[PDB]
Ligand binder design. Structure first.
Ligand SMILES: CC(C)(COP(=O)(O)OP(=O)(O)OC[C@H]1O[C@@H](n2cnc3c(N)ncnc32)[C@H](O)[C@@H]1OP(=O)(O)O)[C@@H](O)C(=O)NCCC(=O)NCCS
Ligand SMILES: CC(C)(COP(=O)(O)OP(=O)(O)OC[C@H]1O[C@@H](n2cnc3c(N)ncnc32)[C@H](O)[C@@H]1OP(=O)(O)O)[C@@H](O)C(=O)NCCC(=O)NCCS
Lengths: 347, 347
């Protein structure tokens, strides 16, 4: 696994048997994680960070300014931990990890997993480490979906949540964007039904999926600032090169089967399913204090759906970041996100 | 030319020599057009309709309800005309048309601008005896032509109705359309534009259209079309089929080289170039009454940029259509577009 090899040092917990909510049983299941700081003696100063679609558990690599003394992820006050999702190439069980029933990696045969599956197996790891109580869960985008699912363990185990730039269930809009991206992979002749050699990826498929995803992550004003025409009496011609560079970078560093496995998780996200008759009714069962962070310019997760979260979670506050960055704001405006999270954790 | 062969009957004007603003000279140039109604004695009841990227000059095929007695394009009051852009497969000179110096132009059709189209179109109108234009109306790409028509001045062009469009290329649209072109460039059937016309880069065209289609919608419109079941096509699973159907339909009925040639026109659009030091200054030179029609939910051409048009064009009125449809609204809300256009022409 060249993806996992590329990472800084991390830990692996092995779960000998895990039942997915489908009923499919995974065996000898690795769960990768990275932690910072130290548990207090009550073992109740744990902060869980949930990562994004294509990142590893090493949150420091894209959120470096949220770590350290006086920052949100203050390793002098908290045990901070991030666990790699199932389906990911970065250490946890997925397409790139060894298949116990032949060992050969799972490849295209890695079972479907849900947001709820990840939350369940991640909690088993926290129980192994001796975590007694979680001070906060914080996650953006896909990680905000896990965050909302963590909340349902209840306020005695999970004290606070910070869902950022996210949704309560799959929407037709995001389903269509992500399926379009998968079809790019499916249509690449190198894909070979998922049977490709790991070093001969469907690179055109991955590249095109990235170009699309990148634009859905930005906004019109953000792209207009980056590329514009000269006054009538950074240039538009540069767009081509920018797109090719962004795409190639992603295609060299991610696995196609994993990209399929992980985006498919989006389609089964729904905090209400089996629990409540509607989204507002499921939200009402979230009893912890919540800080909901969003931007009006996010083109995938709307301002309105964050307002709906705020209306139905009884003890919630909505933080609207003033920015034109689009969905990518939680990384671009990391200082503002840091201050918001730190101020909420301090309360 | 199988694309041109598929159309209802239309007229062709032949321009023996045309100088593109690049300085490249086109020879023996067909310009296709379709008209409805009859000129009055003064030859001053001309209404120009400017078409969209992948349509022909036959406006009735996608705007059928704007035509007829008491409608916007009232063929009892006006001579309505639409001319096919250069670069299109539908009759005007383009990649599919005969190369007078050879075989069709193919990949070697010279670059053309919005301004080139307007120029050669006015030459045709002069041949037809049009003395004055009562209004020009166009949406999206056609709105760009519409703004360029206005520069002939208020004596030749009496009114303009730009819809869902821009004053110049933006980094946002340039990135979306360049991404779509790369899909075609990266299809192995593309062969640098030297493909056989009946062996198109179909995968590239399909993927280009899936992407375009979604940029033409909005989150609310897709979320109405496709959604999950309540907690305890229209299901999310039907998205796949929907995307494949849309894409294939387009790939069967358009030419890859022409897609390239036409989208590239977007990049050189700028009503201020050679004319003014800024967009607001160029807009201030538009002295005709203007009706600007837009939807807030348009993901490609922003509400704000239409508000800018309304602020700088001295005699303008902004019409905001109440709709959740996205860029596609001008076709989906045709009745509201009709009524706005007719009301303005009645003034
Ligand atoms: C990290 C990230 C936030 C950077 O955002 P950004 O600063 O706005 O980046 P830009 O869009 O402006 O592009 C800059 C990159 O392209 C490059 N670039 C710019 N113009 C270029 C050109 N003309 N030719 C080639 N490269 C160019 C720059 O070198 C830069 O690359 P680098 O960061 O590797 O050095 C974003 O690129 C990313 O990696 N992912 C965002 C999505 C995400 O993190 N979430 C995952 C799922 S939500
Ligand atoms: C004509 C148009 C406006 C229709 O918009 P719409 O009503 O929103 O269409 P939808 O997105 O809801 O989809 C409807 C079509 O998809 C099909 N469809 C829907 N669900 C499907 C599924 N699950 N499987 C297969 N097909 C499906 C429907 O049968 C219908 O087909 P038909 O139009 O051939 O009868 C649009 O598709 C279009 O081509 N215009 C875009 C604007 C444009 O091209 N202008 C140029 C630049 S703006």
């Amino acid at each position: 696994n060249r993806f996992e090899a590329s990472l800084d040092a991390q830990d692996i917990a092995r779960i000998s048997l895990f039942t997915l909510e489908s009923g499919v049983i995974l065996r000898d299941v690795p769960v990768a994680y990275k932690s910072w700081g130290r548990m207090n003696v009550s073992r109740d100063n744990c902060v869980i960070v949930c990562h994004t679609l294509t990142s590893s558990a090493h949150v420091t690599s894209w959120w470096p300014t949220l770590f350290g003394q006086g920052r949100a992820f203050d390793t002098s006050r908290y045990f901070i931990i991030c666990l790699n999702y199932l389906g990911s190439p970065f250490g946890s069980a997925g397409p790139c990890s060894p298949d116990p029933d032949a060992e050969r990696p799972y490849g295209a045969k890695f079972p479907r997993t849900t947001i709820r599956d990840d939350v369940r197996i991640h909690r088993q790891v926290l129980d192994r480490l001796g975590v007694r109580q979680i001070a906060a869960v914080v996650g953006a985008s896909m990680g905000g979906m896990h965050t909302l699912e963590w909340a349902f363990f209840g306020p005695e185990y999970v004290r606070k949540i910070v869902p950022i730039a996210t949704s309560c269930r799959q929407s037709g809009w995001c389903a269509a964007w992500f399926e379009t991206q998968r079809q790019c992979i499916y249509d690449d002749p190198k894909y070979l039904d998922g049977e490709y050699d790991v070093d001969d990826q469907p690179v055109r498929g991955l590249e095109t999926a990235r170009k699309i995803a990148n634009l859905t992550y930005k906004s019109k004003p953000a792209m207009d600032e980056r590329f514009h025409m000269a006054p009538g009496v950074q240039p538009i011609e540069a767009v081509s090169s920018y797109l090719r560079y962004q795409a190639q970078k992603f295609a060299a560093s991610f696995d196609a089967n994993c990209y399929i496995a992980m985006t498919l998780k989006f389609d089964t996200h729904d905090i209400s399913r089996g629990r409540a008759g509607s989204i507002p009714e499921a939200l009402a069962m979230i009893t912890q204090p919540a800080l909901i962070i969003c931007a009006r310019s996010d083109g995938l997760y709307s301002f309105d759906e964050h307002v709906e979260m705020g209306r139905s979670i009884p003890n919630s506050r909505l933080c609207v970041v003033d920015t034109n960055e689009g969905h990518d704001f939680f990384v671009m405006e990391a200082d503002k996100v840091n201050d918001a999270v730190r101020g909420f954790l301090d309360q």
